[PDB]
C-alpha cells in the first residue's frame, strides 16, 4: 500500500490512432497517473484529481515520462529486425515503516522479463543478448543512466511522501462492501451458492462459507475492479438442493468493524 | 509470447430490476496488448461504452475494464464479446446476475 509503481508500455507497431507508449502510475492498489504519447501530458486519475497539489508537479511527471518515452522507442532500434515488440517497464519504490525506500526497476520484452536496472552500478542488465543490446543503446545516450537512478532514488520516494502527506485520505479510504448471497439451481438435486461483495476498497477481502455456523469452505472466487477504483469479489459453492438456507457467507474487510454474516436472499 | 484473456462480467452494485447500475467486463491476463471488447444488450453492441487504461499485472500480462451505465431487467440479456489473437472465434460471456 505504501508503494509507488509506474507501469510503462511501448509497442513497436501500434494500431492507428493508438499510442505507441503509455504509462499508468499507481499508489498502492489505485491508479493516480495517466500518460500516453498521443496526448503527451501526465494527468491525475481517480481521487487524485482533487488532491491539493504543488505547482509544476504534473509538469515534472510529464518531463520524466517524456524522457522515458524516447528511450523505450530507442530500444526498438537497438533490437532491429521487424518484431513486432512490446517493451514493458516496472519502475518505482516502496516505503517501509522506517521511512526508507526500496526501489524497483524491471523490464519485460514481448511478455517475458528480461532486464533490470542495478542501482548500485547504475546500469541496465540481463541474461540474454536482447538485454545487453538495449542496455548498450541506453548507455550511449548522455545522462540516461543518471536520470534513471534519480527517478528511482530521489523522485519516486519524494513523490510518494508528497502523496502521503496530502492524499492521506485517498489511501486510507475505507469503503465496506455491499453483500449478496444468492442461490440458483445447478444440477439434479444441487444448487450453486454465490456470495458476492460489491464496490469495496481496499481490495483485501476474505469470503468464507458457513453451514449452520460451522466452517464449510472458501469457494472458488474472483476479484475485479470497478470504474472508480473500488473492487468486486464473489465465491461460489455447490450445495444440496433444499439445503441452501442453512448456509451463510462471512466477509472480512477493513471497512467493516467486525466480520459480517450474510444470509441467503428472500 | 501469447496469453489467453480471462473474462469476468459483473455489475458495480447489486442488481435491482428497474434501478440504474453499471455493467463491467474485466478482461485480464492476456498478451499481447491488442484486444477488442464489446458489451452487448440482447446481442447488439452498446454504443456508449467506456474503458480504463490498458494496464498490466506483476506477471506482465495486460488487463482492462470495460464499463457502461445500464438498468437491469428480468428479461434483458447482457453479455461481453471479446476478441484476441489467442481466440479462434470471439468469446461471449453472459452477465449472470448472481455475480
Amino acid at each position, epitope marked *: 500500500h505504501l508503494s509507488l509503481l509506474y507501469h510503462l508500455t511501448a509497442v513497436s507497431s501500434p494500431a492507428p490512432g493508438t499510442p505507441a507508449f503509455w504509462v499508468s502510475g499507481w499508489l498502492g492498489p489505485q491508479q493516480y497517473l495517466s500518460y500516453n504519447s498521443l496526448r503527451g501530458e501526465a494527468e491525475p486519475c481517480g481521487a487524485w484529481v482533487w488532491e491539493n497539489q504543488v505547482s509544476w508537479y504534473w509538469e515534472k511527471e510529464t518531463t520524466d515520462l517524456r524522457i522515458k518515452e524516447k528511450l523505450f522507442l530507442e530500444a526498438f532500434k537497438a533490437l532491429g*529486425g521487424k518484431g513486432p515488440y512490446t517493451l514493458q517497464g516496472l519502475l518505482g519504490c516502496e516505503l517501509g515503516p522506517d521511512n526508507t525506500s526500496v526501489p524497483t526497476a524491471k523490464f519485460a520484452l514481448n511478455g517475458e522479463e528480461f532486464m533490470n536496472f542495478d542501482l548500485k552500478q547504475g546500469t541496465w542488465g540481463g541474461d540474454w543478448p536482447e538485454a*545487453l543490446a538495449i542496455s548498450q543503446r541506453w548507455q550511449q545516450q548522455d545522462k540516461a543512466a543518471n536520470k534513471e537512478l534519480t527517478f528511482l532514488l530521489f523522485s519516486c520516494p519524494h513523490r510518494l511522501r508528497e502523496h502521503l502527506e496530502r492524499g492521506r485520505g485517498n489511501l486510507e479510504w475505507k469503503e465496506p462492501p455491499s453483500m449478496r448471497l444468492k442461490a440458483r439451481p445447478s444440477s439434479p438435486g444441487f444448487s450453486v451458492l454465490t456470495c458476492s461483495a460489491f464496490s469495496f476498497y481496499p481490495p483485501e477481502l476474505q469470503l468464507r462459507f458457513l453451514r449452520n455456523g460451522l466452517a464449510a469452505g472458501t469457494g472458488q472466487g474472483d476479484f475485479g475492479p470497478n470504474s472508480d477504483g473500488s473492487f468486486h469479489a464473489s465465491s461460489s459453492l455447490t450445495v444440496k438442493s433444499g439445503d441452501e438456507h442453512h448456509y451463510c457467507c462471512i466477509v472480512q474487510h477493513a471497512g467493516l468493524a467486525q466480520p459480517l454474516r450474510v444470509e441467503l436472499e428472500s | 509470447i501469447q496469453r489467453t484473456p480471462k473474462i469476468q462480467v459483473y455489475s458495480r452494485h447489486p442488481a435491482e430490476n428497474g434501478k440504474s447500475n453499471f455493467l463491467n467486463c474485466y478482461v485480464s491476463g492476456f498478451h499481447p496488448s491488442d484486444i477488442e471488447v464489446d458489451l452487448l444488450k440482447n446481442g447488439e453492441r452498446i454504443e456508449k461504452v467506456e474503458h480504463s487504461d490498458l494496464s498490466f499485472s506483476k506477471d506482465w500480462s495486460f488487463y482492462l475494464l470495460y464499463y457502461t451505465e445500464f438498468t437491469p431487467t428480468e428479461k434483458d440479456e447482457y453479455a461481453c464479446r471479446v476478441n484476441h489473437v489467442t481466440l479462434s472465434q470471439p468469446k461471449i460471456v453472459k452477465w449472470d446476475r448472481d455475480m
Partner: antibody
Amino acid sequence: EVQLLESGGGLVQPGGSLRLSCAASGFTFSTYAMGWVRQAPGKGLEWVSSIGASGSQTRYADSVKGRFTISRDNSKNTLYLQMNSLRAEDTAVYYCARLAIGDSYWGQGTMVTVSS
Amino acid sequence: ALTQPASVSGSPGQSITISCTGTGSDVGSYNLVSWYQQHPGKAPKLMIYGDSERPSGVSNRFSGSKSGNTASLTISGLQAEDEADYYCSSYAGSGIYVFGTGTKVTVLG
C-alpha cells in the same frame, strides 16, 4: 583481443561422458550470454546450448535435451559443457561462442569423437 | 526450421542470392536472422545480423533482407574469395538459435 579457447576434446565410448571447457578473455565475461555450436565432419552448423550471462537460465536443442548440461563459472571466466550419454551422432567439432545481437566471436573448436 | 539451397553459383562481378525458408515468427514472438560465412577449416564469420545489418569491417557487397517466412543474402560484385559455405541463422530470443542447412557458393570462370 576477444579470445575463446575450447579444451577437453577427445575420444569417448558410446554412453560415456565428457566435459568441455572454454577460457574467455578480452571482455567482461559476466556481461555476455555464452553458447556452444557444433559441426559434424562435412556437415552443417548445429546450435547445441546457451546459458545466460549470470548462468541463471539455460537452453538446449532438442537433440541434446537431458544429456548435456551447459554451465558457467564467472569468477574463473570459463564456460563448461557436460555431455553425458554420448551417442555416435554427437561426434563433431564443438565451438565456443560469445552471444550478442550485433557481433559474434568464436573459438577455434575442439574435436569430440564418439566411437567404440 | 531453416532451409537453404545446397549450392549457388555465379560469375565474377555479378550478384547472387541465397534464400532461407522457415524464418516466420508466431504472433507476439519475433526472430532475428543472421548470415554466417565459413571458409575451409575455419570458424564461421558473421556477415549479416538483424536481418539486414553489417558488422564493422564486412564488405559492402553483402546485404540481407527478411520477409515473412523467407530471408535472403545477396552477394554483389562477386569476387573469388567469396567462395565458401553460407548459413542463415535465426535467433528467436531467450537464447534460442537455429541454423540453416548451408549453401556452398562457387565462383565460375
